[PDB]
Design a protein around this ligand. Structure first.
Ligand SMILES: C[n+]1cn([C@@H]2O[C@H](COP(=O)(O)OP(=O)(O)OP(=O)(O)OC[C@H]3O[C@@H](n4cnc5c(N)ncnc54)[C@H](O)[C@@H]3O)[C@@H](O)[C@H]2O)c2nc(N)[nH]c(=O)c21
Ligand SMILES: NC[C@@H](CC[C@H](N)C(=O)O)C[C@H]1O[C@@H](n2cnc3c(N)ncnc32)[C@H](O)[C@@H]1O
Ligand SMILES: [Zn+2]
Ligand SMILES: [Zn+2]
Lengths: 113, 297
């Protein structure tokens, strides 16, 4: 009945004044893109930075299991768009926020639905 | 220096045709660092310019393209080069990477261990190797041809590279192989490419283009590396991050290159011609199977 929760562990770490996870891989792009949250190629707009999906995944970076029966990762293999203001902690952003299902944008960021 | 707006500089043909003695490589720009865009890694910038240059060559780009990347893991634990490759390569391109040390990758599959342990059933359209031995940084001797992963790469190219396929292999002054140079003569065209961001370094990517499976040209490996060093010594390259700022044309154009299965007796000058123009790939279309050998003790 015991499971290690990294999601809470990292969130509390940040609140403790902890230095966010670094060396996320930032991609060179046109920044003219659609601005969707998770895409097959970098989609960043002017307000976003495009990162490699795997490097922004807390579970990938910490070498631990993914929180789901299949153990599937929706980051690795893809590219994630982080708002330039939040770009200092890509791992924390993807962890804390959620992707809108219908319009594919970030909830609270760029989602007009 | 008009070369500053290019992704990098390729070794001029006239330098390839010389016969030179190997000297020490003393770069005018040695120690200097190019100014990268904000928050951009060296490996991302380096790989970007490599791909930007590869777009200018003739590369076979078939559907279900197969690309393998050796030495993709960094000391940070990530795979920056793999990320650029995945971006550059057409969507759906199967990308496998490998490294000696554990790392996190965006590739379809990742093998951890010495490259000599890596085995694949099928062949490959494109091979990329950033592999570098840190022990090479220690020079206890003259500079001679290096064994190790260089030995494996030459074997992997001859056996596992599909005809018409291409390779990009990272070399430096002290990290190089004579047979790899000789193997460049088995390609329709070849060059040593130096990225503008890394221009202060003796590093270059040996690029084979459109593998013909047989030598069209006879190349002395020791002489050619001496030629490369001579070129670098007599031609200072201005550090440039310029090409990184235009990504509009970056993605690799999908040419839908034909893939055929032919016996070696079925390959004529007509087929060899199609290969040299990057209009043909010769290999099996079967499923991709890879494995890494594990020593038990
Ligand atoms: N070139 C080489 N040397 C000397 O030769 C030695 C080895 O020569 P080299 O083959 O390593 O060439 P070079 O120095 O140009 O390589 P560089 O360090 O720039 O590294 C290039 C790439 O190799 C890889 N790499 C470098 N170090 C490592 C490492 N420790 N581990 C893994 N990969 C590495 C990285 O991808 C890097 O981008 C160097 O330690 C240096 O004292 C020089 N000295 C002077 N004074 N002027 C020179 O121009 C010069
Ligand atoms: N800084 C360069 C570095 C990463 C590349 C760059 N960071 C990148 O983005 O692709 C080169 C990589 O070569 C690997 N390597 C060296 N020798 C071997 C070997 N014999 N077998 C397998 N791997 C090897 C070594 O583990 C190192 O991670
Ligand atoms: Zn993950
Ligand atoms: Zn929405």
């Amino acid at each position: 009945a015991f499971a290690v929760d990294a999601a809470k562990a990292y969130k509390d770490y940040l609140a403790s004044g902890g230095q966010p996870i670094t060396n996320c891989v930032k991609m060179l792009c046109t920044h003219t893109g659609t601005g969707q949250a998770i895409t097959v190629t970098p989609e960043a707009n002017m307000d976003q930075e495009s990162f490699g999906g795997a490097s922004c995944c807390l579970y990938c970076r910490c070498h631990i299991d993914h929180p789901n029966p299949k153990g599937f990762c929706d980051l690795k293999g893809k590219y994630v768009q982080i708002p330039t203001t939040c770009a200092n902690d890509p791992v924390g952003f993807t962890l804390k926020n959620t992707v809108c299902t219908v319009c594919g944008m970030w909830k609270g960021y760029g989602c007009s639905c | 220096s008009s070369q500053a707006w290019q992704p990098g500089v390729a070794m001029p043909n006239l330098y390839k045709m010389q016969r030179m003695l190997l000297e020490k490589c003393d770069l005018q720009n040695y120690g200097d660092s190019a100014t990268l865009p904000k928050g951009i890694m060296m490996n991302v910038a380096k790989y970007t310019q490599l791909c930007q240059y590869l777009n200018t060559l003739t590369l076979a780009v078939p559907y279900n393209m197969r690309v393998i990347h050796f030495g993709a893991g960094s000391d940070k634990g990530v795979a920056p080069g793999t990320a650029v490759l995945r971006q550059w390569l057409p969507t759906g391109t199967l990308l496998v990477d490998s490294d000696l040390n554990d790392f996190v990758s965006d590739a379809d599959s990742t093998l951890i261990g010495d490259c000599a342990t890596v085995h694949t059933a099928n062949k490959w359209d494109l091979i990329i190797s950033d592999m570098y031995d840190p022990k090479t940084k220690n020079v206890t001797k003259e500079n001679d041809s290096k064994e190790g992963f260089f030995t494996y790469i030459c074997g992997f190219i001859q056996q596992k590279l599909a005809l018409g396929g291409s390779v990009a292999i990272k070399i430096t002054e002290h990290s190089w192989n004579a047979d790899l140079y000789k193997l460049m003569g088995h390609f329709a065209w070849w060059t040593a490419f130096v990225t503008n961001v890394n221009a202060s370094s003796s590093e270059a990517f040996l690029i084979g283009c459109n593998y013909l499976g047989k030598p069209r040209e006879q190349i002395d490996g020791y002489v050619m590396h001496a030629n490369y060093i001579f070129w670098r010594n007599t031609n200072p390259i201005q550090l440039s991050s310029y090409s990184l700022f235009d990504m509009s044309k970056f993605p690799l154009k999908l040419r839908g290159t034909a893939v055929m299965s032919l016996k070696e007796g079925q390959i004529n000058d007509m087929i060899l011609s199609l290969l040299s123009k990057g209009r043909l790939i010769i290999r099996e279309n079967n499923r991709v199977v890879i494995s890494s050998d594990v020593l038990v003790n």
